[PDB]
């Protein structure tokens, strides 16, 4: 059970809605995501922010369940959420796999880039399909920040979120680094606001 304090408070709803994490893709939609709730008549689909937050801590609960807080890794092949992962890699341990992913880090034990994780997070499954595919041969759970137009194969934790937006990807990465620190107990009180801002996770145009 849960203490019921994990509801979507107005402040958490304010930053989620102002960051446009609810808008979806066009009429194209994969029937494996029943999380959709109506759509704009122009063609923009709408997702339920309640389910995104709900299944966020589910991803968080499985991320922090791993004892060692350094085996966790994240993939960001697309340059759009580049500096977001280093913030994850700087707050609660972990080793950055930011930028380019070496094809063989999972299987081959001779290459200098050989890690072994127990749980992986990715941003766009379409953009880094190599990461999930290669990881499938070493039987490791994965986490994906999918969108209603993205495939959801070989993934046991798929975060519904907007992939085309600075305000969305930076905020969702910031959140999933927040309660994991809270669940680990490094923030003590859950009601105390964090002193770090998602705009740090944001990527500057220059």
């Amino acid at each position: 059970s849960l203490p019921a304090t994990f509801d979507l408070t107005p402040e958490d709803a304010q930053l989620l809605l102002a960051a446009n994490t609810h808008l979806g893709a066009r009429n194209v939609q994969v029937h494996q995501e029943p999380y959709v709730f109506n759509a704009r008549p122009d063609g923009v689909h709408v997702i339920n922010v309640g389910k995104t937050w709900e299944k966020l801590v589910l991803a968080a609960r499985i991320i922090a369940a791993i004892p060692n807080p350094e085996d966790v890794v994240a993939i960001s092949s697309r340059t759009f959420g580049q500096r977001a992962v280093l913030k994850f890699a700087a707050h609660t341990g972990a080793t950055p796999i930011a930028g380019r992913f070496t094809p063989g880090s999972f299987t081959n034990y001779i290459t200098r880039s050989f890690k072994e994780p127990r749980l992986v997070i990715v941003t766009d499954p379409r953009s880094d399909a190599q990461a999930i595919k290669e990881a499938s041969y070493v039987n490791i759970p994965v986490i994906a920040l999918t969108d209603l137009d993205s495939p959801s194969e070989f993934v046991d934790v798929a975060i519904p979120c907007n992939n085309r937006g600075k305000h969305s990807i930076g905020l969702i990465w910031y959140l999933l680094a927040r309660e994991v620190l809270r669940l680990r107990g490094a923030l003590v009180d859950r009601t105390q606001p964090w002193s770090i801002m998602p705009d740090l996770y944001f990527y500057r145009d220059p």
């Binding site: 004892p67 060692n68 034990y109 072994e116 070493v138 039987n139």
Partner: protein
């Protein structure tokens, strides 16, 4: 000298892992031939034959040796591998290193009378590789392993003392036959028998409890 680089190498070197059934049960990714030999010292090597292969090119041929080697103790652990090399010694020494890497357990039972130790397979099993499929039929006691000479000695070291074998297709392709049997013997554990029908608690992986004896 070993100085293992992978995680599973450290646990066995520390003595935490005793028998091979733990790795088979949990199906951890293992590609290091050190563990298999240390876990089961009594492994015997056998090679069917060598089929030469040459690379046609601008001029001449540079034939290699393709050696198929199977290694397995006659108590329930066997493994198969195929490798190509220029010289015979390298090909056979690489065939064992991959066949031992691919050791697969086999489920032993009876044709069914339920008095003594297991003798044969519980169910009929097959696996199609290439264009040939092999069948393994449970057999009354004393029948023996009736099969092709290459397959029958493969099943001789499998631990099963008797089995009825059916073959289809061009059995002359030897390398296709064992891999069809190799996937067949692994498939044998994929049959849901009415005996393994109660639900059991899922065990914790030994890597998590022994986490401090891993890496660094």
């Amino acid at each position: 000298g070993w100085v293992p680089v992978t995680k599973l190498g450290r646990l066995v070197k520390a003595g935490k892992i005793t028998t091979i059934e733990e790795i088979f049960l949990h199906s951890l990714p293992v590609k290091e031939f050190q563990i298999i030999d240390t876990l089961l010292p009594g492994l015997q090597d056998e090679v069917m034959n060598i089929k030469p292969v040459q690379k046609q090119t601008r001029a001449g041929q540079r034939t290699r040796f393709k050696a198929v080697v199977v290694v397995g103790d006659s108590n329930g652990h066997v493994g198969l591998g195929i490798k190509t090399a220029k010289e015979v010694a390298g090909a056979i020494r690489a065939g064992i290193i991959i066949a031992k890497l691919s050791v697969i357990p086999i489920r032993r039972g009876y044709w069914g009378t339920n008095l003594g130790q297991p003798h044969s397979l519980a169910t009929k099993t097959t696996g199609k590789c290439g264009s040939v499929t092999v069948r393994l039929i449970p057999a009354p006691r004393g029948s023996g392993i009736v099969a092709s000479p290459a397959v029958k000695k493969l099943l001789q070291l499998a631990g099963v003392e008797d089995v009825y074998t059916q073959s289809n297709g061009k059995t002359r392709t030897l390398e296709n036959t064992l891999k069809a049997a190799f996937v067949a013997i692994g498939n044998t554990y994929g049959f849901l028998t009415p005996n393994l029908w109660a639900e059991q608690p899922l065990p914790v992986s030994p890597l998590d409890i022994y986490s401090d004896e891993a890496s660094a």
